[PDB]
């Protein structure tokens, strides 16, 4: 959509002249966005996981996949197959729409916003972020919700380094430091 053709028209040229590439598709491009939370407290209240899934469905136009514990761990008294988290993968048009609607409105609505860190890359151009609360998103009316559950946004790009990931994300008007 708007962010996608903005990228196509402007960011490709900007990054190409910035890094002195030689091919059109050597510029890093964002390939997916993953929104998940491991509710943890679904050991005993399975309705909590359904409420979180409804929250994610409201936030992003997809039905969340319920993720279960891979290995039994005795520390948190869970075993194999227990539904623990919810996850949504966004690609293409929906990814671009959510990318617009996050950094245009939802981030400004953060209480006492100061700026997202720049050293939060895994070393391969990927980004991760914790919203710490689900109420900021416009898809929420601040009264339907019952808890303080927060997401974990992960932006997966084809960048070859955290430097190029920083460059790509700063080409999209990210509120860094």
């Amino acid at each position: 959509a708007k962010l996608h053709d903005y990228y196509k028209d402007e960011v490709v040229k900007k990054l190409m002249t910035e890094f002195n590439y030689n091919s059109v598709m050597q510029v890093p491009r964002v390939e997916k966005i993953t929104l998940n939370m491991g509710v943890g407290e679904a050991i005993a209240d399975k309705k909590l996981l359904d409420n979180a899934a409804a929250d994610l469905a409201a936030i992003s136009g997809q039905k969340p996949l319920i993720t279960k514990a891979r290995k039994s761990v005795a520390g948190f008294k869970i075993r194999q197959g227990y539904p623990i988290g919810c996850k949504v993968t966004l690609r293409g048009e929906r990814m671009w729409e959510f990318f617009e609607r996050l950094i245009t409105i939802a981030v400004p609505r953060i209480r006492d916003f100061r700026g997202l860190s720049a050293k939060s890359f895994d070393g391969r151009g990927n980004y991760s972020m914790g919203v710490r609360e689900q109420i900021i998103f416009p898809e929420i009316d601040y009264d339907k919700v019952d808890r303080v559950r927060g997401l974990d946004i992960t932006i997966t790009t084809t960048a070859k380094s955290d430097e190029e990931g920083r460059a790509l994300l700063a080409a999209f008007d990210f509120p860094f430091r």
């Binding site: 959509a1 469905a57 409201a58 136009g61 997809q62 039905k63 729409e97 617009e100 609607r101 950094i103 245009t104 409105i105 981030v107 400004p108 609505r109 916003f113 100061r114 700026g115 416009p138 898809e139 008007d173 509120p175």
Partner: protein, 66 residues
């Protein structure tokens, strides 16, 4: 998509309180009016306005009327 397991999805006009018309698809069911976007967010204008909590010698001086 997978044929009606998802919620609805449609274009909704989401403009700021200072103009800034922004047509964004979402799933709410009603147009919404909100605060400023990052276009008019007070982030680069209050960098020192936020860091102002302090000052005792200045408010002691005004108390020194004598």
């Amino acid at each position: 998509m997978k044929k009606d397991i998802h919620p609805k999805y449609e274009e909704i006009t989401a403009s700021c309180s200072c103009g800034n018309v922004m047509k964004i698809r979402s799933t709410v069911g009603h147009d919404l009016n909100l605060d400023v976007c990052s276009k008019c967010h007070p982030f680069f204008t209050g960098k020192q306005r936020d860091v102002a909590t302090g000052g005792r010698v200045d408010r002691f001086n005004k108390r020194f009327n004598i």
